[PDB]
Amino acid sequence: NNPEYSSFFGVMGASSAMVFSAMGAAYGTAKSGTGIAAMSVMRPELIMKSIIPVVMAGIIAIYGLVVAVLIANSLTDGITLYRSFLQLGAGLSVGLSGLAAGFAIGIVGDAGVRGTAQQPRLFVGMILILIFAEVLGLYGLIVALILSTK
């Protein structure tokens, strides 16, 4: 029969998927918000357009939530150790990829908002770079989904 401690790795997959995605989103929001705060003192009207980096950072927390809820609803008492490993792998693959995407979003958003304060034309390029930064968390989600549903 399957081992008793098997559910541990699945539960850690869920908690990791949520925790590291939350850390990535927190860092992204922190840096982007600092950028917006510095930008505002000079260019007030850009404040709302410049919240977009915060939103793209929050996407990463939403991705972590998706994987965490999916794993949590997939957990069972008799979970085979193989499924527990799949869930742990998916959880980390989304959580740490989201952490990296949060780093990218935070740094790019801070620098890009500060720049867009000084030169409005940057906004489009900043959005493109933020998209390239967020698609990393998206790829992490894809890997997590393939692992988990497998």
Partner: protein, 397 residues
Amino acid sequence: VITFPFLFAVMFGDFGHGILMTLFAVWMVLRESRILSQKNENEMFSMVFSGRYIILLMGLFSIYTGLIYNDCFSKSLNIFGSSWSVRPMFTIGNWTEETLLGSSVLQLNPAIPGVFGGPYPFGIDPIWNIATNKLTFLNSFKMKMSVILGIIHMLFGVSLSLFNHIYFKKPLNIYFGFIPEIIFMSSLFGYLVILIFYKWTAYDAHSSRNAPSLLIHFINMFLFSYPESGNAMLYSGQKGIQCFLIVVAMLCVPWMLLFKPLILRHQYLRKKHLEVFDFGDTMVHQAIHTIEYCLGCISNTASYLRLWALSLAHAQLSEVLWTMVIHIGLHVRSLAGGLGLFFIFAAFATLTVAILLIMEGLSAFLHALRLHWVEFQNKFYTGTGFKFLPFSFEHIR
């Protein structure tokens, strides 16, 4: 005007919050004269008011999508009568009071003919709001919906590109882009939509024990790695049809890439010699366009899962904000629970407005904007023009 509210509604689907949003939009539209005359530096209010006509369609289509999800503040409505029924598990099945006593969460199945009575005629069956296995079904349905909507939307944009090409007389664009572009997209990802609908219309509980996985088959379809153990084939002739599809997809990449630079070389460097043409730069340009087209197809098809991601986030946040605010006042034995509900409902209203309508509404808004800007407009809309800014008496302010 329509797809942006519609995709926002896919993300924000909730009939009650849609009611609130529509009421707000109607309030602003009706009071627009007063609001227009009473201008002030309130950035939030002024911007939202300028967007008022967007929010009207946003709220209405969030109402529609919440009804299709059959959800209302995290609760379904059950107006047509559920298709899922429990009594056949006892009448025809082998259940009993002793089984209910001995199992806490138990089960349900449609194999016995009486349990399942067809699809709930307008949206999702209401039983899912009380079923614990809810998300096992909802996540699959929403992943498939996201794939379908994204693929159809990207195909729509690709089609819109033709209306630009014909007018602008870009015949090489037409014939070695759009036609290859749409062929690529339909062969690779349109086929996935076809498979999704095929699985829904073909595979059943009687095939449950061996039903395949669309993700695994779709990836092995790229790898040409047809297995011979485990899950079974989706339909007869799938090997041949899939092989044809992947082969055409492969051929299309050179089809999009090589011929445009080559025919441009022909007609602008062999002719007119037998502004100037640069073979290396043009080759790099068209190689860039093709690499971007293909990797953009994959990344954008994946990115439309953003719909499901946001839908799940919204659904779970509404569920928690119900079940740990107003559930508190509802699940109390005494009659003072009415006054408790008064206060707890004040808290519920404030928190729901702060979180669901503001945070998640804003997230859905900007995600639909992002999708339109990139994942849909990259197909046709180049977007390098000017704004006609006329000498036309703006000085009323």
